[PDB]
Symmetry: C4
Subunit: 267 residues, 4 copies
């Protein structure tokens, strides 16, 4: 219809994006001011009303989008679903999550990512790069599990705060992989009791730092290439063809002229 | 005019660049010697006169440049403006900045960058690479803000030195992202009171270290490519054409011979 | 034979891989639960029987493989040998290794790598990349040995816990290379006695961090390229030809048409 | 002459390289054993004779090389000069260097690099990559000097152990750049007195870590490419032509056939 089309043009405009971005920023600022314990009752009450007004603006925005695109059309996008979930969660008073309680209202500042297309493309590149590093990440997980079982059995009885159980071992091995006080804080005190403990910890460090750097580089290299392609597509409608595809078409043109020269010209 | 042209040749020469570089080095050395608290009144007075003589040489240099290129011509370059600002600021006695007070005379050693073309090209590559990582940098800023609001609300009342307010939280989360005493100094003491605090800090570390490495690699890769192109242009007048452009012209030559063979030869 | 072929089809299937993966996971879980010191006698006895059942499933699996491929055919693969060794070691009660004792049953969780082809290809890429960094790794080893001899002679008598002998020096230089408390924990206390010790430690850090990063990057870059090729071969039967080889064949096609134009057409 | 040629063939052989490598290894082992303070007089005397025998083998080796290649021919190589200097220094009893005293005999283990061609090529790649990062390294040096002057003036009077003079400031800023206890050890104690000190230290960290990573990556990328080319040249006599040069010759072949088709065929 004409009306739904007039709304789609309004939603897709730069001005609408700018108003929504400004309200996300305002909402983030009021939640940031609400961390201050020294504020008066009236000051807190004022900021809480600004939070409610921001949330109402988002309800109008999402409802406006659901009508303009349709229920199936709106929920077809993962970003629209995220926008819907983030806003709808705040309207629910009794919440049943899978952790403790979603009292973190500040997570609605993540809508800056979903609303700004250049920011959206950065997160998209990162998310799309994840399956390609799955096996490297699985290898690191396997190394961690093996190491945590070994560390618990080896050092749990003599260093129970750091290695007393599997959970404690995983945590201090994560600390060890980040190189944080690994020697002065952990391994030299362990070696005072277990002089050969360096045979466990030094290969653990060498293996995990190499694997985690492989994991991070694999993510970054691929996320950068995906985002660059998505940026090209968002501006021109297409992306740059890979070097292999350019050389393929170059070879096809050479095969076409070879046939035209050997039989269609040399006869 | 002839005179302005004789001065332009003097300014653009290697010998003039070498004299100016030597005076920047001398000025840096005297400001370095002036940090020594044990120096006598006469020794300090002597060094302060050397600083004044260096500054006078720079005034002559900049005035010589303004005449040789013209007011609009000189200020057309960002490096000349920087050179002008750095020198002119020192001649002002009552200073009104946006911080505290610009008593840091040693910042005039940054003119080594503006005067040496190879050093200038390194900084140019770095500055020109900044817009391309803007969205990655914005993502890191968003993650930091969200995390600092969460950390203040979660740990501010029990760990007020580290998380008592937003500013304290941002600072210790920056420390946490750099992995500096993150566990022994911050997270194990926090976990003594909040046993599940690792659910906040370990994903914070994983996310920020990956993003900051993405930010740094994005800067370095692009700065290197920009500087390499600028170095090529400064020596030959042009830079190396991208592989895609070389393959494009190769394809155009193939299309030109295909037309010349199918109709201009096979008829 | 038909029977050996029916077994080869069973072994090579996705369902068989999934059952073996599930049993490796179950075995890892029971060994993880066995780290818990609070468990009763009956609970420990139950888990130990689950470990025995998992091990019996692996014996059947390996025996089934030896028959289906043949003794020479099975042991032709390094992964099958690893699978054989890992399982067979557990059946030996008196063990004579080259360290202390192979009581680390959790190492059989490494079979997740050997059984999952995508995980197997990651480790293969890493192992195949090792000879190419051999000289960089040898250089780092040489720098470490020289530095440890120098550190022992220079600081052994005044700092015997850190540098009293070659073994202690190698360990604290490894700690120094990882930047862990290098200054506050090691070098500022050493400088209190040897004021010029920074002349040794700062170049040691600069050299080893650059070399270890060269070593890690060399591994990662090559492991990534090898794994990518192996992934391509496992799915299509072949891998992508290098750019140099594509340009070589493109040049050969140009030489073929040049001969066909100069003599076979211009005569 | 025939005799000088028979010696050149002996020197250039794999067996001679293997004997020299073995003696460098033996010499490194005896100097490593000599770090042990518990050794008897006879044991120390025995090892010192093995060191003398190793040194005599090197004198014969170098003299054999000087005759076989000639004085100008031998000293034409930087590796031969290094080999000469390292050996000749040990024969001098009263030594006048530019530091304290060259009592570090273990530095002759660096001959493993000069004698093994694959190790030699790694160091060559690293050394040849240094001029190309000169400007990045100069930028880091400039940032360090400016920062050390600022830190001395700002914090020298209140934190004299860390910033009391230029030398102390450079050392703790190097520690700060490596992120070692930068916050818990340095910046939080400084902020207790100077609450805005984070305005100095956080931008210092951001700038230096980015620049040092740019410096390291620039070295590694170029050293890898140089070493790869040198490895190709040592085995085949030539190296792989750059992609740009391959595309240049491909374009030249297209221009040659275009002339042969437009005028030599279409007339
Ligand atoms: C791939 C990396 C995966 C890291 C996983 C970390 C382990 C999570 C469990 C954990 O950290 N704790 C158990 C919380 O129940 C905290 C313990 O360290 C605790 O027992 C005390 O030491 C404080
Ligand atoms: C993206 C990274 C951004 C880092 C931003 C750091 C926060 C800046 C504020 C700050 O660091 N302080 C407040 C100065 O007013 C210092 C506090 O830590 C202070 O309250 C005491 O704890 C000492
Ligand atoms: C390329 C990196 C190679 C690192 C090699 C580390 C050296 C291995 C020997 C070692 O670490 N110790 C000797 C065990 O016999 C431990 C000593 O540090 C010990 O004497 C005490 O200080 C605790
Ligand atoms: C680009 C990085 C360049 C790092 C250069 C380090 C500075 C060298 C001087 C130095 O480190 N000291 C002065 C030795 O004379 C040591 C002081 O720190 C000393 O005064 C005491 O604090 C102990
Ligand atoms: Na670190
Ligand atoms: Na630390
Ligand atoms: Na520390």
């Amino acid at each position: 219809s004409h009306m739904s089309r007039k709304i789609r043009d309004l939603i897709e405009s730069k001005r609408f994006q700018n108003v929504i971005t400004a309200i996300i920023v305002l909402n983030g600022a009021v939640l940031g001011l609400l961390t201050d314990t020294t504020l008066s009752a009236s000051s807190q009450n004022l900021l809480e009303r600004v939070d409610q007004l921001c949330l109402t603006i988002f309800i109008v925005e999402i409802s406006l989008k659901i009508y303009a695109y349709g229920v199936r059309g709106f929920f077809r996008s993962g970003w629209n679903l995220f926008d819907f979930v983030i806003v709808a969660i705040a309207l629910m008073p009794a919440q049943g999550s899978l952790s403790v309680l979603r009292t973190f209202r500040i997570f609605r500042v993540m809508r800056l990512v979903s609303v700004i297309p250049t920011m959206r493309r950065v997160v998209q590149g990162m998310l799309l790069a994840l399956p390609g590093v799955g096996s490297v990440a699985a290898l690191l997980t396997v190394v961690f599990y093996i190491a945590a079982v070994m560390a618990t059995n080896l050092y749990g009885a003599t260093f129970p705060e750091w290695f007393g159980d599997l959970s404690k071992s995983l945590y201090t091995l994560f600390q060890v992989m980040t190189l944080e006080s690994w020697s002065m804080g952990i391994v030299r005190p362990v070696m005072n009791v277990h002089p050969n403990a360096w045979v466990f910890f030094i290969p653990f460090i060498m293996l995990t730092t190499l694997t985690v750097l492989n994991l991070f580089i694999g993510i970054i290299v691929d996320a950068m290439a995906i985002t660059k392609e998505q940026e090209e597509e968002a501006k021109t409608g297409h992306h740059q063809e890979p070097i292999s595809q350019t050389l393929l078409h170059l070879g096809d043109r050479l095969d076409r002229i070879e046939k035209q020269l050997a039989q269609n010209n040399e006869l």
